[PDB]
Amino acid sequence: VHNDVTVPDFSAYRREDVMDATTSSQTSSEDRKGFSYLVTATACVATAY
Amino acid sequence: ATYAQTLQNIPETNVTTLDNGLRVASEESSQPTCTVGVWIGAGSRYENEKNNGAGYFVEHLAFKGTKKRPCAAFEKEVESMGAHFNGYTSREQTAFYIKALSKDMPKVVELLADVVQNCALEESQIEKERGVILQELKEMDNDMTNVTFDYLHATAFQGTALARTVEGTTENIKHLTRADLASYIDTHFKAPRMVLAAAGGISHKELVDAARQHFSGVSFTYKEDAVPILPRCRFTGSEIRARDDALPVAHVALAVEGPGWADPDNVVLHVANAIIGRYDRTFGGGKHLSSRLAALAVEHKLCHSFQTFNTSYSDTGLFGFHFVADPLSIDDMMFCAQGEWMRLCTSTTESEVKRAKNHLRSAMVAQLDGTTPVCETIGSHLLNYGRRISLEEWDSRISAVDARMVRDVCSKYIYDKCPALAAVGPIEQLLDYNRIRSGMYWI
């Protein structure tokens, strides 16, 4: 039955800032997104050059 | 006698607290009939991994009799007074209430008290209900909508308590012990966390005297008077795809973490969900329906139905939408849906919010269409918002909302957010988390 279904554990992959299941992942969101988008933004700058 | 006024006329909801912590509240109407019940602040979120499913197993016994009045004794006494007893158990809120003649107002409270306090928990019955719950699971499992929301929580709140079903695991049901159900009751069904609410032709005073009489819990240490604060549940942009190409339609639900009861934005969130609204193949409106998504849905045969939602919780919540479609229109539908979400964040119009606000108020009013619903609002308000919130207030708050506000708030909770997804059925067409994640920006 669908009640016996659990999402597995993703700690081996989770970003250090969202590893703790009892902390609002939201606070670290702006950074997680800020960082990745920075990489991209930089890549664009390079290509642009 | 303009609407405005009818609002400020509705009698105030009275609330009085007892020395044990129990909070009694009620809204008095001339109604000859009524509704009274105890809204406990307990649910599957309070359960841990070992007893997931207690509050539900317990729900199945709060009606099979108490210590004083066994099975027949209870039922007979209740059936014979033309009263309706029934309840429910959510993730973080449980409730037990009766529908009886305003006359019986005081005998009912006695009955309510006898249930939350002296449940027989006949170890004979337990083994029977065990088989019943197990049976209801087989059934509920065929309710795509349920399977889909459970899963939604299962992944959106993966790793936390909010990611559990209310009904619990097949193992816990098969093994829970009388003792487990016992302590569950002792640990959670406690005065400072319960709320005796009533609505109808009832004297608040009479109501509270009756409360004093059977709801005479005692409190010695501070511990008892305290309401525990649950550990925070971590939201996670993720997805769970349970595929079965054998089911006729496919269900899809997508959501973002919502704020929580306390937060005022919720009002704005509701006004927004009011714009996109909901739809279904039997909505006479048709191609002319106001909700673009609905309209689009109709013009393109995009779904058998769709619906937005803003499921609130103490500290968190789920703001999203759910739709049922045919395997081959899942993508177009999902596309259009996110489309409207992005439109909410970027281009909501004053005309939209105007309609939305009206529609909302109307729903707000329907939330108090009878002693039972009214009662349910009291029990929940006190439990959630702490106090009662009058339509006059809600209406006030709602009026403050405007396009700009909707956009800001929606952007705030939606734009460039990692959503939670749950998909069930012949879901091959809808696909790739990434493709869906990019639907979260620009629109």
Add this chain to the structure above:
Amino acid sequence: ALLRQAYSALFRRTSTFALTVVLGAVLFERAFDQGADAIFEHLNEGKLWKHIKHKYEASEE
């Protein structure tokens, strides 16, 4: 928090992102081009006409 500020002010809005890339290149270009040349010219001291130049450039007659 730069990551937050950066995200919040540049990377979030698709527009501000684009402008940031344009602006970026611009500053990056200057910086890069200069430093690159610097590194090259340094690795090649006295060998470039830049270096030899003065001996005949308005140096005689």
